Design a protein around this ligand. Structure first.
Ligand SMILES: Nc1nc2c(ncn2[C@@H]2O[C@H](COP(=O)(O)OP(=O)(O)CP(=O)(O)O)[C@@H](O)[C@H]2O)c(=O)[nH]1
Ligand SMILES: [Mg+2]
Ligand SMILES: [Mg+2]
Ligand SMILES: [Mg+2]
Length: 301
């Protein structure tokens, strides 16, 4: 089963899930074993804090159960790591708002633009009207691409001149979305990390201005991060989380990367729902995140 997802996690499975079998085979449970396991989790980009938690709970569970063979740790690890992802297994529900405003945050180069386009198409397939806001106002090329895409796919794009105030662009977009009975408004934002302080104050301004029109907006603050960037995805998540209230995460480029274990670090460190995972370039390759599917593909024997 899960043949499709297993293939997309092939490189990650070398170090996590089924990758543990060869590590445990024929060994006993002792300090050396747990030190080996810790190393492999760290190599898999699981993170120091989340790895220590896994080792601590795994050590205690094996001791009180009086386990002897390392192979017996496999089931406890699947449950421990499965729980981490189950805590952030909540699909995004955009129903019942006029419009549902998704504030897309993240740095450049992690797949934010692609995710906007794929989400827009998916919502249209679900019977919804979609509108986009080009809030990345100082990157003329980024604004131009989004406008070209909207005209390709017959989706309205709200944009202003290069250098316009991003909060004002998104304000006008909410007004236009409400006036045109739009179901979902997807607002792009800047992704330049030169000067953390400024970008973060820019996002807080965008949120403040939104609530002039709708105290519920933004209904979703979605971070996009790139699984192939390893711990950079975690530092980026911490940055945007502390600055603005993240409510969802999309993790792209799980396919073809050996660093897919970062998802456990992102899940455990922040507890923010992971809404989608990217496992390909097709529109449908942006899949809703299902913790059970992911664990089963990872730990399948
Ligand atoms: N293998 C893979 N590629 C993906 C995935 N999601 C997006 N991509 C691809 O990664 C590349 C970057 O996507 P993009 O949306 O442009 O990121 P960006 O931050 O907007 C780039 P810029 O800063 O110039 O605007 C693209 O080629 C995109 O098709 C994914 O889930 N898996
Ligand atoms: Mg050792
Ligand atoms: Mg080891
Ligand atoms: Mg872009």
């Amino acid at each position: 089963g899960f043949a499709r997802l297993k293939r997309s996690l092939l490189k990650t499975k070398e170090n996590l899930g089924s990758g543990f079998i060869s590590l445990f085979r024929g060994k006993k449970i002792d300090d050396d074993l747990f030190e080996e396991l810790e190393e492999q989790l760290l190599i898999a980009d699981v993170g120091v804090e989340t790895t220590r938690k896994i080792i601590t709970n795994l050590t205690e569970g094996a001791s009180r159960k009086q386990l002897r063979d390392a192979e017996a740790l496999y089931g406890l690890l699947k449950e421990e790591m499965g729980e981490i992802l189950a805590k952030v297994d909540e699909p995004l529900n955009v129903e019942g708002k006029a419009p549902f405003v998704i504030l897309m945050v993240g740095v450049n180069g992690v797949g934010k633009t692609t995710t906007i386009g794929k989400l827009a198409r998916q919502f249209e397939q679900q019977g919804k009207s979609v509108m986009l806001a080009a809030g990345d106002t100082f990157r003329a090329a980024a604004v131009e691409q989004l406008q070209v895409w909207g005209q390709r796919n017959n989706i309205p794009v709200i944009a202003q001149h290069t250098g316009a105030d991003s909060a004002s662009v998104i304000f006008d977009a909410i007004q236009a979305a409400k006036a045109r009975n739009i179901d979902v408004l997807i607002a792009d934002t800047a992704g330049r990390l030169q000067n953390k302080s400024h970008l973060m104050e820019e996002l807080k301004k965008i949120v403040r201005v939104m609530k002039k029109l709708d105290v519920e907006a933004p209904h979703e603050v979605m971070l996009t991060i790139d699984a192939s960037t390893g711990q950079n995805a975690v530092s980026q998540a911490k940055l945007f989380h502390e600055a603005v209230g993240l409510t969802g995460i999309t993790l792209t480029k799980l396919d073809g990367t050996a660093k897919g274990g970062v998802i456990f670090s992102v899940a455990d460190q922040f507890g923010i729902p992971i809404r989608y995972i990217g496992v390909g370039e097709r529109i449908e390759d942006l899949r809703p995140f299902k913790a059970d599917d992911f664990i089963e593909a990872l730990f399948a024997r």
